[PDB]
Design a protein around this ligand. Sequence first.
Ligand SMILES: O=C(O)[C@H]1O[C@@H](O[C@H]2[C@H](O)[C@H](O)[C@H](O[C@H]3[C@H](O)[C@H](O)[C@H](O[C@H]4[C@H](O)[C@H](O)[C@H](O[C@H]5[C@H](O)[C@H](O)[C@H](O)O[C@@H]5C(=O)O)O[C@@H]4C(=O)O)O[C@@H]3C(=O)O)O[C@@H]2C(=O)O)[C@@H](O)[C@@H](O)[C@@H]1O
Length: 230
Amino acid sequence: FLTAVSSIDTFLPVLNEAKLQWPTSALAASSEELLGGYVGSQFYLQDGKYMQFQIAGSSNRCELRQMIPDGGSEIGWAVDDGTTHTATSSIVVPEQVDGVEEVTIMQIHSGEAPQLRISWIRSKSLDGVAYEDFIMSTVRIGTGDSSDNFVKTHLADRTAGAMSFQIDVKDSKLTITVNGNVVVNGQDLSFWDGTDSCYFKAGAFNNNPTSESATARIKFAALAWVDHHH
Ligand SMILES: O=C(O)[C@H]1O[C@@H](O[C@H]2[C@H](O)[C@H](O)[C@H](O[C@H]3[C@H](O)[C@H](O)[C@H](O[C@H]4[C@H](O)[C@H](O)[C@H](O[C@H]5[C@H](O)[C@H](O)[C@H](O)O[C@@H]5C(=O)O)O[C@@H]4C(=O)O)O[C@@H]3C(=O)O)O[C@@H]2C(=O)O)[C@@H](O)[C@@H](O)[C@@H]1O
């Protein structure tokens, strides 16, 4: 068998507060199964150090979903509880194979919709400007499908090396920090006030591929989910 992610220390904290959804939103592995060596080509320890996710198919996923720690059930939190909800990661996004067009690698999601997706995308025009092979944030400020429901931002061009992300939610404001630099500062999340079902996700969620067989692949050198009280 392939080497399991839980065979080293690095990812135990997040695995203790996650379930794995694969190849759909249906459960693939509970937190205890993840901590206890769940492994396959979709989810294995790569190069002795990376938690690697792989998935093919439109809207299929191999994704961690935030859980209450220590064997608990699904978590839900609010964007304005006065704490800071923080997701940190260090991600190697390799060159994606032909047919893969957008891969969501971190999210904030609720009972109804994704508040935030951080995704790699092959090609995209944003605000009249073309970008290629880059990392994007998509924030929902509404529940509809037209442009004004979203704020989409170029976060960084994709790099060969690891790229760090920090997602902070505090007092209905979102901050995104890439390689130590604040890119998105205080994006408003007030539309979501009253929602108590938000949670973090991370991994690989395959969006709008041109081929159903093309396999997205994303490597995490680090991932953590932490609520900071103030
Ligand atoms: O490309 C465009 O045309 C526009 O796309 C806009 O972004 C899109 C994305 O491309 C994706 O389509 C994205 O997909 C969302 C999807 O709409 C749902 O919200 C889905 O929800 C699932 C949850 O992630 C979660 O896995 C949930 O799990 C439940 C479930 O009951 C399950 O059975 C289990 O037992 O318990 C779990 C639980 O843990 O809570 O299931 C949900 C499900 O219905 O399957 O999540 C995906 C997602 O992961 O984000 O939607 C966005 C969008 O914003 O609508 C945007 O880029 C726009 O600019 C483009 O024009």
